[PDB]
Amino acid sequence: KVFGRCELAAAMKRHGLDNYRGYSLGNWVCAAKFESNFNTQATNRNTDGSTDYGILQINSRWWCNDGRTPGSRNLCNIPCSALLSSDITASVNCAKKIVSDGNGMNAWVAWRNRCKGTDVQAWIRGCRL
Ligand SMILES: [Cl-]
Ligand SMILES: [Cl-]
Ligand SMILES: [Cl-]
Ligand SMILES: [Cl-]
Ligand SMILES: [Cl-]
Ligand SMILES: [Cl-]
Ligand code: NA
């Protein structure tokens, strides 16, 4: 599913991401924009052979099992395929674990480089929520 900007912002808000671990909603929408362009089916293979899945490009090295990342962990206890669903639940719940792990949203290198320090509220402007 490719989400619209306000649609995703509403869906993330319904799933408990507004102010989660103190990150306003615009952080989460900005991160998804540059990670996936709001496409739940986005995948990309990393240099080391692991693969990132879904609207927030969650990595099989640490977070999910795709059966093809030898020696990796599955800290969200999900198949990576779960993260491609039109329903964002699995992605959201796994993102909550990730952002709770010590490094906050810096885990998303695109968030650090493109969203952090910026006017992230712009990302939810004009949306009804
Ligand atoms: Cl947009
Ligand atoms: Cl695994
Ligand atoms: Cl959803
Ligand atoms: Cl933090
Ligand atoms: Cl990253
Ligand atoms: Cl509300
Ligand atoms: Na894994």
UniProtKB/Swiss-Prot annotation:
Domain (C-type lysozyme) spans 1-129
Q: InterPro entries of this UniProt entry?
A: Glyco_hydro_22 (IPR001916), Glyco_hydro_22_CS (IPR019799), Glyco_hydro_22_lys (IPR000974), Lysozyme-like_dom_sf (IPR023346)
Is Ribosomal protein found in the keyword set? no
State the Pfam families in the record: Lys
Quote the PANTHER family the UniProt record gives: LYSOZYME C (PTHR11407:SF28)
* Record localization: Secreted
The text of the family note is: Belongs to the glycosyl hydrolase 22 family.
Name of the molecule in the record? Lysozyme C
- Additional comments on file? Lysozyme C is capable of both hydrolysis and transglycosylation; it also shows a slight esterase activity. It acts rapidly on both peptide-substituted and unsubstituted peptidoglycan, and slowly on chitin oligosaccharides.
